[PDB]
Design an enzyme around this catalytic site. Structure first.
Site, short mmCIF file in Angstrom:
data_model
loop_
_atom_site.label_atom_id
_atom_site.label_comp_id
_atom_site.label_asym_id
_atom_site.label_seq_id
_atom_site.Cartn_x
_atom_site.Cartn_y
_atom_site.Cartn_z
N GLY A 102 0.79 -1.21 0.00
CA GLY A 102 0.00 0.00 0.00
C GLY A 102 0.83 1.27 0.00
CB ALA A 116 -4.35 5.56 2.03
CE1 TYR A 117 -8.67 3.35 3.69
CE2 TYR A 117 -7.17 2.26 2.17
CZ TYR A 117 -8.35 2.92 2.41
OH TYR A 117 -9.23 3.16 1.37
N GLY A 118 -2.65 3.64 7.16
CA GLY A 118 -1.70 3.35 8.21
C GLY A 118 -0.48 2.59 7.70
CE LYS A 159 -3.98 1.71 11.32
NZ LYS A 159 -5.13 2.60 10.96
CG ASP A 199 -11.67 6.46 5.49
OD1 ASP A 199 -11.16 6.53 6.64
OD2 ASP A 199 -11.60 7.42 4.68
C1 SN4 Z 1 -5.33 -3.90 8.98
O1 SN4 Z 1 -5.75 -3.09 7.93
C2 SN4 Z 1 -6.59 -2.04 8.21
C3 SN4 Z 1 -6.94 -1.82 9.56
C4 SN4 Z 1 -7.88 -0.82 9.81
C5 SN4 Z 1 -8.41 -0.10 8.73
C6 SN4 Z 1 -9.45 0.92 8.86
N1 SN4 Z 1 -9.48 1.64 10.00
S1 SN4 Z 1 -10.55 1.18 7.65
C7 SN4 Z 1 -7.98 -0.39 7.44
N2 SN4 Z 1 -7.08 -1.35 7.17
MG MG Z 2 -11.04 9.39 4.66
#
Ligand code: SN4
Ligand code: MG
Ligand code: CL
Ligand code: CL
Ligand code: CL
Ligand code: CL
Ligand code: CL
Ligand code: CL
Length: 348
Positions: free
Chosen positions: A27, A30-32, A49, A164
């Site tokens: 990635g 964007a999400y961490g 994550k 998200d």
């Molecule tokens: C482990 O991958 C992740 C964890 C939380 C989120 C969100 N908060 S939408 C997105 N991806």
């Molecule tokens: Mg957003």
């Protein structure tokens, strides 16, 4: 407690249970800070994550708690869900890091369909799934606020999930200029006209559906004001009934400086589209948010006749978000988060 092993990833040391193998960064962030992995317990490819500095301030500690609460609640086929959450800590006293595990999402609507128009049957199925997930989200009194193509994951079978939840609110700078993070926003939240509610998300669905039908962004404004002008040319300038509801006296005064315009004929804007698609767009893209169609009402619209099943469109368990108005110290938010980590029960 599983056995953990350590390895160097994304500029830091990750410590994860043995079940997760072959970790590799994935990635754009964007999400961490996220790695892909193979989960040997379930056979799934997963995303892991690692939260960055989760308890460094009151704002960050509460945001960490919020993300975990939202992800633990979401249990629906068209919404991201939580497969696992873990910490290597053996006690609250040594608790410092939080890891979240979800299904690995390859492609989103944006990277797949950019600059391209799809067939009507595809548009029916994709918008149906967004609305099915949104009915669930809204039934828990959650407002998404950021529906857009990059937040919609899609697989090879055109199955869709909404992403998200619980990330940082978008900043003034992120919303400035010729940017996709503003093109899908309802006017009343884009310009702070009034206290908004869940109806803002239906405006976003209308913008997405129009773009799947034409292959083009509906309202690609170069800034807030240019975008408002594009919107009012299509849907017309506000009438006295809606002006009453704009509780911002300054915003109300700016709107009245603009020459009045009637709503356009949508059959001449969306040339060639299914007449049932045109009718639904007219019911989503209504300036007065009180009068927009809801997700539950839209699922019953004739455009979705070949997919609609009222016995397979579930609602959510109640979601208690009284914590959102609560003031606590860093260590109190951290203790609440720890309790939510150790109480997690994996899905069947
Ligand atoms: C482990 O991958 C992740 C964890 C939380 C989120 C969100 N908060 S939408 C997105 N991806
Ligand atoms: Mg957003
Ligand atoms: Cl393990
Ligand atoms: Cl999922
Ligand atoms: Cl830890
Ligand atoms: Cl996007
Ligand atoms: Cl936001
Ligand atoms: Cl709850």
């Amino acid at each position: 407690r599983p056995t953990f092993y350590r390895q160097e990833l994304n500029k830091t040391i990750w410590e994860v249970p043995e079940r997760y193998q072959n970790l590799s960064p994935v990635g754009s962030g964007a999400y961490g800070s996220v790695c892909a992995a193979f989960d040997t317990k379930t056979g799934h490819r997963v995303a892991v994550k690692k939260l960055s500095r989760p308890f460094q301030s009151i704002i960050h500690a509460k945001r960490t708690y919020r993300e975990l609460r939202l992800l633990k609640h979401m249990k629906h086929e068209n919404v991201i869900g939580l497969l696992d959450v873990f910490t290597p800590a053996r006690s609250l006293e040594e608790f410092n890091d939080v890891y979240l595990v979800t299904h690995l999402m390859g492609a989103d609507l944006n990277n797949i369909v950019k600059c391209q128009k799809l067939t009507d049957d595809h548009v029916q199925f994709l918008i149906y799934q967004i609305l099915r997930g949104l009915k669930y989200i809204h039934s828990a009194d959650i407002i998404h606020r950021d529906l857009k193509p990059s937040n919609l994951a899609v697989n090879e079978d055109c199955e869709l999930k909404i992403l998200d939840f619980g990330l940082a609110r978008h900043t003034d700078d992120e919303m400035t200029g010729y940017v996709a993070t503003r093109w899908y926003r309802a006017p009343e939240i884009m310009l702070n006209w009034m206290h908004y509610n869940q109806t803002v998300d239906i405006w976003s669905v209308g913008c997405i559906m129009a773009e799947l039908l034409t292959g083009r962004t509906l309202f690609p404004g170069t800034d807030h004001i240019d975008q408002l002008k594009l919107i009012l040319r299509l849907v017309g300038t506000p009438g006295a009934e809606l002006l009453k509801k704009i509780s911002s006296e300054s915003a109300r005064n700016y709107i009245q400086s603009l020459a009045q315009m009637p709503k356009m004929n949508f059959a001449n804007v969306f040339i060639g589209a299914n007449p049932l698609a045109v009718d639904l767009l007219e019911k989503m893209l209504v300036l007065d948010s009180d009068k927009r169609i809801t997700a539950a009402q839209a699922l019953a619209h004739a455009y979705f006749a070949q997919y609609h099943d009222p016995d397979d469109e579930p609602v959510a368990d109640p979601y208690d978000q009284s914590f959102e108005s609560r003031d606590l110290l860093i260590d109190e938010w951290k203790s609440l988060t720890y309790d939510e980590v150790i109480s997690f029960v994996p899905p069947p």
